[PDB]
Design an enzyme around this catalytic site. Structure first.
Site, PDB file in Angstrom:
ATOM      1  N   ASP A  72      -1.051   5.938  -6.057  1.00 48.94           N
ATOM      2  CA  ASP A  72      -1.662   4.393  -4.654  1.00 48.94           C
ATOM      3  C   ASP A  72      -2.486   3.084  -5.047  1.00 48.94           C
ATOM      4  O   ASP A  72      -2.743   2.761  -5.384  1.00 48.94           O
ATOM      5  CB  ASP A  72      -2.828   5.415  -3.842  1.00 48.94           C
ATOM      6  CG  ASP A  72      -3.535   4.231  -2.888  1.00 48.94           C
ATOM      7  OD1 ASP A  72      -3.132   3.421  -2.333  1.00 48.94           O
ATOM      8  OD2 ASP A  72      -4.278   4.571  -2.388  1.00 48.94           O
TER       9      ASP A  72
ATOM     10  N   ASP B  34       0.541  -1.355  -0.106  1.00 49.18           N
ATOM     11  CA  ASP B  34       0.000   0.175  -0.035  1.00 49.18           C
ATOM     12  C   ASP B  34       0.618   0.754   0.223  1.00 49.18           C
ATOM     13  O   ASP B  34       1.426   2.001   1.199  1.00 49.18           O
ATOM     14  CB  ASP B  34      -0.945  -0.439   0.819  1.00 49.18           C
ATOM     15  CG  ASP B  34      -2.051   0.914   1.379  1.00 49.18           C
ATOM     16  OD1 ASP B  34      -1.787   1.980  -0.019  1.00 49.18           O
ATOM     17  OD2 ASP B  34      -2.502   1.403   2.270  1.00 49.18           O
TER      18      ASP B  34
HETATM   19  C1  LIG Z   1      -7.690   4.194  -0.134  1.00 52.92           C
HETATM   20  N1  LIG Z   1      -6.912   3.690   0.650  1.00 52.92           N
HETATM   21  C2  LIG Z   1      -7.783   2.994   1.564  1.00 52.92           C
HETATM   22  O1  LIG Z   1      -8.543   3.069   2.369  1.00 52.92           O
HETATM   23  C3  LIG Z   1      -6.527   2.352   2.687  1.00 52.92           C
HETATM   24  C4  LIG Z   1      -6.347   2.659   4.061  1.00 52.92           C
HETATM   25  C5  LIG Z   1      -6.516   2.053   5.446  1.00 52.92           C
HETATM   26  C6  LIG Z   1      -4.497   1.419   5.210  1.00 52.92           C
HETATM   27  C7  LIG Z   1      -6.574   2.464   6.838  1.00 52.92           C
HETATM   28  O2  LIG Z   1      -6.525   0.404   5.066  1.00 52.92           O
HETATM   29  C8  LIG Z   1      -6.623   0.155   3.749  1.00 52.92           C
HETATM   30  C9  LIG Z   1      -7.668  -1.226   4.318  1.00 52.92           C
HETATM   31  C10 LIG Z   1      -8.111  -2.389   2.772  1.00 52.92           C
HETATM   32  C11 LIG Z   1      -7.612  -1.495   1.482  1.00 52.92           C
HETATM   33 BR1  LIG Z   1      -7.651  -2.821   0.093  1.00 52.92          BR
HETATM   34  C12 LIG Z   1      -6.935  -0.099   2.007  1.00 52.92           C
HETATM   35  C13 LIG Z   1      -6.429   0.930   2.803  1.00 52.92           C
HETATM   36  N2  LIG Z   1      -4.742   1.941   2.007  1.00 52.92           N
HETATM   37  C14 LIG Z   1      -5.161   3.286   0.596  1.00 52.92           C
HETATM   38  N3  LIG Z   1      -4.081   3.427   0.218  1.00 52.92           N
END
Ligand SMILES: CN1C(=O)[C@]2(CC(C)(C)Oc3ccc(Br)cc32)N=C1N
Ligand code: NI
Ligand code: NI
Length: 402
Positions: free
Chosen positions: A232, A36
């Site tokens: 992202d 991520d």
């Molecule tokens: C857009 N975005 C999110 O909503 C987030 C934030 C956070 C890590 C808190 O929780 C998550 C969990 C799963 C997924 Br799949 C993405 C995310 N990471 C990104 N990049």
């Protein structure tokens, strides 16, 4: 420029995130961890959950140390929370090193884990500024670099899916590579173009121009980056600010006007289908984002195909048909260059030189008429400032930075 052992170390399900195998603790507990670039915490499931069959068990790790401090992370969808600590961490299909990193042991969560995604934690690869509870919690990659001789750089080749799809009941499997500490030349073709990291928090970049089938949207370029533009890996879609989203949808609708899709399709809430192998790809336009170059007055463009922004989903009832979700969506928090963008390209997160590189991916999905492309330079005399300055809150201003 070869990192054979790290090639093909990413897996996942379409739309549910790319993950890398990691080990935590002593003896090593292996977990699948979401890659991520849009967050900065290393956080792993550490208690039973319906969507998990394994989790981090602190009690089984002789090397675990509790930091005696909790962390609570709310976001649009929901929340994760847990206990902060440190432990030994490695990437089995990454560099041959072990580091002591911060780990947030997730004890409770809401709408965090995704059913069938096959991951149990998240590796936040962005910068300390956006770490929780605050920027004193050193992110994983910072620790890796500080504790080893691994160069301050990683690169992502995210490979997307396409028809014919193998399964009707489950989502398509995706793959890719995360090269830690370098650039692998086998993962790209042609030129590698760099755009500056505007500021080290998210991987923030500047878009200077947008075209849809060669047609300039002709907007004030600040609109493209309102209130930021970021790269992202943890977002599926290309997400665009409201004004830009509306202009793009208008253009894509006009191009594909021979087909009258329901409103739900353009909202990403409904699939549209054609008989197997008959999808009229040629009625859907290419999209070009021009990114600020390393040189004043230069830009380069990345160009994506409808094969990137129309996501394949194999429906149970419609298994005779190729069905697609529109994967460009509206944002109120700026442009997000998600998997839709990244799957066209080999993306180099060159932290050492404060820049992000793009090249055509050796694995991008295309047809015999058009390709995803990375092209430049484009020169603009007296290029304007396309960056947006987020209004400064008193709370933000009051922070000290020692
Ligand atoms: C857009 N975005 C999110 O909503 C987030 C934030 C956070 C890590 C808190 O929780 C998550 C969990 C799963 C997924 Br799949 C993405 C995310 N990471 C990104 N990049
Ligand atoms: Ni393995
Ligand atoms: Ni002070």
């Amino acid at each position: 420029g070869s990192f054979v052992e790290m090639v093909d170390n990413l897996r996942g399900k379409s739309g549910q995130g790319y993950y890398v195998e990691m080990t935590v603790g002593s003896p090593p507990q292996t977990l699948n961890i979401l890659v991520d670039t849009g967050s900065s915490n290393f956080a792993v499931g550490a208690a039973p959950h319906p969507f998990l069959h394994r989790y981090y068990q602190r009690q089984l790790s002789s090397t675990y140390r509790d930091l005696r401090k909790g962390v609570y992370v709310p976001y649009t969808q929901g929340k994760w929370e847990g206990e902060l600590g440190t432990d030994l961490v490695s990437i089995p299909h990454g560099p041959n090193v072990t580091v002591r990193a911060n780990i947030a042991a997730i004890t409770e969560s809401d709408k965090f884990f995704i059913n069938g995604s096959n991951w149990e934690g998240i590796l936040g690869l962005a910068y300390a500024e956006i770490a929780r509870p605050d920027d004193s919690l050193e992110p994983f990659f910072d620790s890796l670099v500080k504790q080893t001789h691994v160069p301050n750089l990683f690169s992502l080749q995210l490979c997307g899916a396409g028809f014919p799809l193998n399964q009707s009941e489950v989502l398509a499997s995706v793959g890719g590579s995360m090269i830690i500490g370098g650039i692998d030349h086998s993962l790209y073709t042609g030129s590698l173009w760099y755009t500056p990291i505007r500021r080290e928090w998210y991987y923030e970049v500047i878009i200077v121009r947008v075209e849809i089938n060669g047609q300039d949207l002709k907007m004030d370029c600040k609109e493209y980056n309102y209130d930021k533009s970021i790269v992202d890996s943890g977002t599926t879609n290309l997400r665009l600010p409201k004004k830009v989203f509306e202009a793009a949808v208008k253009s894509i609708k006009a191009a594909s006007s021979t087909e009258k899709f329901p409103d739900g399709f353009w909202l990403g809430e409904q699939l549209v289908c054609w008989q197997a192998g008959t999808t009229p790809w040629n009625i859907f336009p290419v999209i070009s984002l021009y990114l600020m170059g390393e040189v004043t007055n230069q830009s380069f463009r990345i160009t994506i195909l409808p094969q990137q922004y129309l996501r394949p989903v194999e429906d149970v009832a419609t298994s005779q048909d190729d069905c697609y979700k529109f994967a460009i969506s509206q944002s109120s928090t700026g442009t997000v260059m998600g998997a839709v963008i990244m799957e066209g390209f080999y993306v180099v997160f060159d932290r050492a030189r404060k820049r992000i590189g793009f090249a055509v991916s050796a694995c991008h999905v295309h047809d015999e008429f058009r390709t995803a492309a990375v092209e430049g330079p484009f020169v603009t005399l007296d290029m304007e400032d396309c960056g947006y300055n987020i209004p400064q809150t008193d709370e933000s201003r009051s922070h000290h930075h020692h």
